[PDB]
């Protein structure tokens, strides 16, 4: 029966009916009439539903009709939108493409998405997908989110810094703009903390997994998990008669590249009887071609009936948003690396830490997408209940708040110490944040955003970097500095397959500038530009082609940003004595707090906090510079300062006058060196 | 087929069975026509709690027979029909630990209801079998999708600890 599409006046196309049948069978569908009533009755809703419950695709579409019905019989009023946020760029796209099909309209027209570096809207857009940061990016110009009627903060469980900020402001919005609906969705079953936070808003629970999963435990507690994991993989390969791939969760590349090798050894021992096992590493910095393996199908198996299998060994990248098809065996050792930023010593850590009562589920939930499946945890069930905490900390309780305080100040939060965070940041961290901003001239001593500060918020950057870049425009080096900004705002472009480490390091040496990693990246960026951006040249020189193409994009965006505020892009003459001098000075302008000096003991100690550090062995330095500017204080096996740079102490006193003011300093070696320099300059 | 009638008890009444009855039922452990075990099992009462590790649960928290667990616990029967109390298709279960030892044929237990039960219809179960004298391992034992771990594994270790 001919229904007309209300959006384009078309008959609904022949494709839609078939899709319609399948989507009617999604679990959320029965709730359709029930949801609308709640939305009509309340301003805030909390919604919960397991993976595969169809929330993300059906709920925003049902929001759209509810907008339309509210326009029916009113005049056609000012164009308002329904927003759906999505924590990751890849998800914001993959939803929209499906949802532009379901509503039988052309993507970007009535149904769109708005992610970084690509806007797919039109003036007929009603339903806008965006990453979380973009809905944070819009508010900073329009605090009441003025274009929006129904918001939808999806995947709330991920608790990302974009999302935690939003929620608080959006509850603030729920005051004031007293017409805007909010529908907070979470995919995890979470203990209704969302329900409290938003004034006891109604909680809607929707079930909906695809298949059931079997959970398993070791009865005793194995003492060497990698030996256990490797041993577990072999055991499964040999005993399980069901076809399927094994997805093993490890901590990182030092292990996922070991585990591949050692598992290859034992399958080479098991010889002709056992089926072929193919071991595929998978971590977030593998180049595109190495990632693409995961789509590869299994062998046709050996003739004797021995099942051949693919074994994907992966960090938490396989837990969320990456959907590995064909998995029917998940091995979960129960660890992940967790950043935790220790605001007392500015040591940002990367230790192996136990997963949470949620994360355990999500790892197991990979099985049960295509057929029933089994999850093997290498820990004991009593271990599960009593050591793993119930959910993993939000991002906000874990990271440096420099980027966030500046965003909140631009949004016109003055009252940060009462800001309504769902899980508030530590007092000690915020005191680093304000202290970070106060040196940087972002905020005056009475805490208002200064003129320089308001410009610093406009850049998609961290506060230190923005101070560098702005200051680079008065040193006549902004074109060179713009690139050293772009490369440091993307995940690091060095590739090092451990099967090829020596050859890859040789490529790194050829790029290496003498004065440290910051000029080494500018050399890397220029070399990529000279070679017409040819993917091959990225490969043989062990540079991720994703990072550079992302990086060059970031640079173009920052140029556009500079132009809108009349920061002239300039260069010093390459012929000039000042060219590599003006680059290093600009760095020092903005990472002036994060500077080390070489004490007589042969170790570095970081300026003022006396924290003992070593050059991170990836540095292309071949010397210990006496004063070292560094971008990231890392805990792994030791404190390591990464991305290390030689600076000259005269720059420190001239360029960054506030912090290196001698009279404040803790009395020690750092002060002794600095004092002599100031007397010399005078 | 194998069968044991009655309720677990120590009385010499025809309506009760005991350890000795289960044992002399269990007596033919040698391979009498190659005989490994039976296709079907007919009992009155439930075993010691089918509901453990089951992907569904029965409508009532049934207790049941420790002993008949033991007879299943080596009979490993393709099917187990249990009378009394409640319908219940329990989903399957395996007959070993998983990953430790080769695959072996899975049981399915099927609870039937009384005629004229206050729910009506379900009490009659209409079904195929095919035998373990003509079936073969590549058909008989390939683990059918919904397979669970062995429900009397834990209790066997407990019940052995005193009794055997």
């Amino acid at each position: 029966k001919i229904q007309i599409n209300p959006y384009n006046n078309q008959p609904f196309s022949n494709r839609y009916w078939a899709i319609w049948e399948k989507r009617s069978q999604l679990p959320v569908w029965e709730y359709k009439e029930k949801f609308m009533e709640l939305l009509r009755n309340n301003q805030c809703i909390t919604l919960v539903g397991e993976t595969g419950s169809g929330k993300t695709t059906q709920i925003p579409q049902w929001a759209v009709e509810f907008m339309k019905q509210q326009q029916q019989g009113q005049p056609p009023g000012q164009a308002r939108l329904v927003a759906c946020t999505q924590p990751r760029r890849v998800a914001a796209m993959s939803v929209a493409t499906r949802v532009a099909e379901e509503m039988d309209v052309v993507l970007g027209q009535e149904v769109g998405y708005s992610i970084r570096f690509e806007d797919c809207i039109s003036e007929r857009t009603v339903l806008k997908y965006c990453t979380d940061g973009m809905l944070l990016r819009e508010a900073m110009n329009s605090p009441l989110l003025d274009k929006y009627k129904v918001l939808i903060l999806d995947e709330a469980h991920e608790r990302t810094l974009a999302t935690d900020i939003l929620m608080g402001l959006i509850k603030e919005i729920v005051r004031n703009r007293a017409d805007i609906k909010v529908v907070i969705m979470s995919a995890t079953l979470d203990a209704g903390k969302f329900q409290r936070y938003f004034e006891d808003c109604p909680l809607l629970s929707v079930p909906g997994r695809t298949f059931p999963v079997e959970i398993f435990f070791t009865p005793n507690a194995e003492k060497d998990y990698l030996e256990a994991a490797i041993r577990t993989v072999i055991q499964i390969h040999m005993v399980e008669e069901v076809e399927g791939d094994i997805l093993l969760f490890l901590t990182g590349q030092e292990e996922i590249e070991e585990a591949c090798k050692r598992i290859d050894r034992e399958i080479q021992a098991l010889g002709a009887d056992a089926g072929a096992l193919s071991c595929i590493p998978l971590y977030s910095t593998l180049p595109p071609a190495a990632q693409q393996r995961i789509f590869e199908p299994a062998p046709p198996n050996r003739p004797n009936g021995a099942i051949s299998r693919k074994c994907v060994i992966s960090t938490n990248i396989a837990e969320t948003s990456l959907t590995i098809d064909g998995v029917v065996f998940v091995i979960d050792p129960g660890f992940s690396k967790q950043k935790v930023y220790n605001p007392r010593i500015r040591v940002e850590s990367l230790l192996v830490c136990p997963i949470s009562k949620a994360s355990a589920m999500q790892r197991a939930g990979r099985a049960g997408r295509t057929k029933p499946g089994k999850c093997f945890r290498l820990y004991t069930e009593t271990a599960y209940g009593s050591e793993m905490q119930d959910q993993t900390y939000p991002e906000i309780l874990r990271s440096n708040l420099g980027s966030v305080v500046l965003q909140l100040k631009k949004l016109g939060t003055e009252d940060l110490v009462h800001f309504d965070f769902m899980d508030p940041p530590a007092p000690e961290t915020l005191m680093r944040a304000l202290e970070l901003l106060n040196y940087l001239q972002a905020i005056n001593d009475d805490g208002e955003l200064t003129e320089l500060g308001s410009l610093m918020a406009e850049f998609p950057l961290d506060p230190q970097l923005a101070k560098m870049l702005i200051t680079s425009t008065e040193l006549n080096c902004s074109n060179e500095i713009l690139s050293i900004t772009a490369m440091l705002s993307v995940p690091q472009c060095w590739v090092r397959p451990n099967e090829m480490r020596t050859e890859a390091d040789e490529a790194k040496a050829r790029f290496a500038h003498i004065d440290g990693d910051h000029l080494t990246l500018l050399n890397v960026y220029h070399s990529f530009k000279q070679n017409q951006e040819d993917p091959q040249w990225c490969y043989d020189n062990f540079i991720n082609y994703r990072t550079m193409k992302t990086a060059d994009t970031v640079r173009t965006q920052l140029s556009r940003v500079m132009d809108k505020y009349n920061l002239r892009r300039v260069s010093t003459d390459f012929k000039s004595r000042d060219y590599y001098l003006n680059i290093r000075k600009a760095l020092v302008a903005g990472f002036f707090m994060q500077v080390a000096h070489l004490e007589r003991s042969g170790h570095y100690v970081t300026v003022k906090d006396n924290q003992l550090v070593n050059l991170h062995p990836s540095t292309v330095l071949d010397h210990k510079p006496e004063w070292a500017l560094y971008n990231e204080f890392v805990l792994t096996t030791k404190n390591f300062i990464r991305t290390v740079t030689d600076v000259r102490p005269e720059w420190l006193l001239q360029i960054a006058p506030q912090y290196y003011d001698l009279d404040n300093f803790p009395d020690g070696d750092t002060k002794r060196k600095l004092t002599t320099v100031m007397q010399t300059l005078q | 087929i194998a069968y044991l009638s009655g309720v677990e008890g120590s009385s010499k009444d025809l309506s009760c069975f005991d350890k000795a009855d289960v044992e002399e039922l269990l007596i033919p452990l040698g391979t009498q026509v190659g005989f490994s075990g039976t296709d079907i099992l007919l009992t009155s009462v439930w075993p010691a709690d089918i509901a453990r590790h089951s992907h569904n649960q029965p409508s009532k928290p049934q207790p049941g027979s420790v002993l008949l667990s033991k007879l299943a616990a080596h009979l490993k029967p393709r099917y187990h029909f249990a009378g009394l109390g409640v319908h219940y298709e329990r989903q399957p279960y395996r007959n070993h630990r998983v990953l430790l030892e080769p695959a072996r044929h899975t049981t399915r237990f099927i609870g039937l209801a009384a005629i004229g039960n206050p729910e009506k219809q379900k009490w009659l179960y209409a079904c195929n079998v095919k035998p373990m004298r003509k079936m073969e391992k590549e058909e008989l034992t390939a683990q059918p999708p919904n397979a669970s771990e062995f429900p009397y594994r834990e209790l066997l270790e407990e019940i052995a600890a005193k009794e055997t």
């Binding site: 398993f216 435990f217 055991q235 069930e381 | 649960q57 298709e89 379900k122 179960y125 079904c127 669970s148």
Partner: peptide, 23 residues
């Protein structure tokens, strides 16, 4: 080698399964 042990979560207090495929 590694010792398996189970602990599975209940789905529903219910009453059907495999038999259509078991038949």
């Amino acid at each position: 080698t590694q010792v398996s042990m189970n602990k599975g979560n209940i789905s529903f207090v219910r009453g059907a399964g495999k038999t259509v495929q078991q038949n």
